[PDB]
Amino acid sequence: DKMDYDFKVKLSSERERVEDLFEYEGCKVGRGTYGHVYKAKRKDGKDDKDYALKQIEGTGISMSACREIALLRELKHPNVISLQKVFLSHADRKVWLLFDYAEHDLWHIIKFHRASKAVQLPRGMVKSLLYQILDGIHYLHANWVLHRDLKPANILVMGEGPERGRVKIADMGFLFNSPLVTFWYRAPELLLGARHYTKAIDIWAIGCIFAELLTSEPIFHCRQSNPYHHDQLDRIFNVMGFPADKDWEDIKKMPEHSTLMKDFRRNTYTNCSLIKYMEKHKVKPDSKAFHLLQKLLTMDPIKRITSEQAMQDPYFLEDPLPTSDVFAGCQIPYPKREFLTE
């Protein structure tokens, strides 16, 4: 209308449309708040590889999509998912993204073991999974990038291919860095009303995941607006024990602390400790694994260890050493992604 015409038509002629480059019709592998995700394959190109093709929800370039595109474009690490290409569909104003396809994830892997006959997670696989999760998150944190929602469904593992058994941290979404039905991987400072995300909040989630890899069940499992959630804190205390004054000195500085004192009594959790919980799931409390888990699951954020230091833990120098291939060259029993239609 007011732009150059030759400019419009040239770019229109030259722009790579998604429809034409990839076959995705009836291959929808995921549908959530993120938008729509398909198991795609390249049409024209002589490419046999599988791709994860995601259509971001909403028209235009949202805050949630803009930052996602922004970071992913600069981010480059083996254990974080690499953005191949962005497609901007001008007509409908949708944004598509293209990733190397991750067949498996910890959510589906944990679910496979938990189901069982009535075969628990092998110990070497868990160490390798943990090491790689800490490798990627350390890369993000080194670049002052926080995840803000680490959970098993966001920790992808690659299927049969060049990158077999490599962990890939997904989901780079998320107002002033300020969070104001499933709170199982949320740190207690968030529950007690911390106004800002930190590196320490992600490290708590890694502990909850590591816990879950060992025991095959979520350590802080709990039934279903505001930041304060009683029943989630109750579950945390029943596992961990109520934090003593010397454990978390600056708990008094939390906004929901006066609410915590009204609703909880510390004597109720005297027979509760992480040593006792993990013992009931056949995990030795004097094992290098357990001691790292405890350092990850420190209640006080300033006393929680960094990912930098977690990789340095002697757990990873104990037999078996962590492998690049999380399956270690073993036949992958976990089923592949079921398709959808909508």
Partner: protein
Amino acid sequence: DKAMAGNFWQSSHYLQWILDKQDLLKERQKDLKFLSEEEYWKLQIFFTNVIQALGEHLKLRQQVIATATVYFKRFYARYSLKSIDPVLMAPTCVFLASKVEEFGVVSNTRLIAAATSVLKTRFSYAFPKEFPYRMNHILECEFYLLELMDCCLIVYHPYRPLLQYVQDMGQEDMLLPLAWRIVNDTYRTDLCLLYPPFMIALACLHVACVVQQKDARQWFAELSVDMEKILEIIRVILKLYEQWKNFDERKEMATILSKMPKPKPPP
């Protein structure tokens, strides 16, 4: 403590949007058939001021303004002034930069009101008629901007290194205010497309030191940096102000904007 703060050497800025000066001049020949070299830099200065005044109206920190200015520079580095109206591109770049730097989605009505009000108030000498574009144009133009830039949104500016040098110098009171303005002034030139931001920082600090008669040869000598490339930036910054002296913006720009190439309409 911003994101990607020390990744520059593996970043998209360095590996793509640090351009060759020959290539920059070559594509600029297409617009130089209408406008002279003088009239082209006078146009750069003007839209640097338009983007500035859009930032100050919307209440935006200098860094979010700096990115908007770079996006603008990158686009017309590779395309003609006929391609998209730079009066539309400016507010689209400010709108886009604010989303990237996490300063809220600057509202539709507030974005249009900003452009309308700035052009009527502070730029009536060049633009006699009202800001003619509505929000659906800004949204369309945004899609072209993000496409040309190859979705490269994170941009590194000189301010963060300048701070680190003046702290290290131990003269933040005397030098940092004057250094910071010279860094603002580098955006009137091509420098951000041609040299990395720490080198731009080092040049501005040197000119800051020269202006205030603060001897710093030893401090500068102790750097392990290619000083010839710093002297290049100083020469541009020194020229910049001589350009400033002889350039009356408000008398000249109305005539220059008519000489800009016209966008061809649909047949």
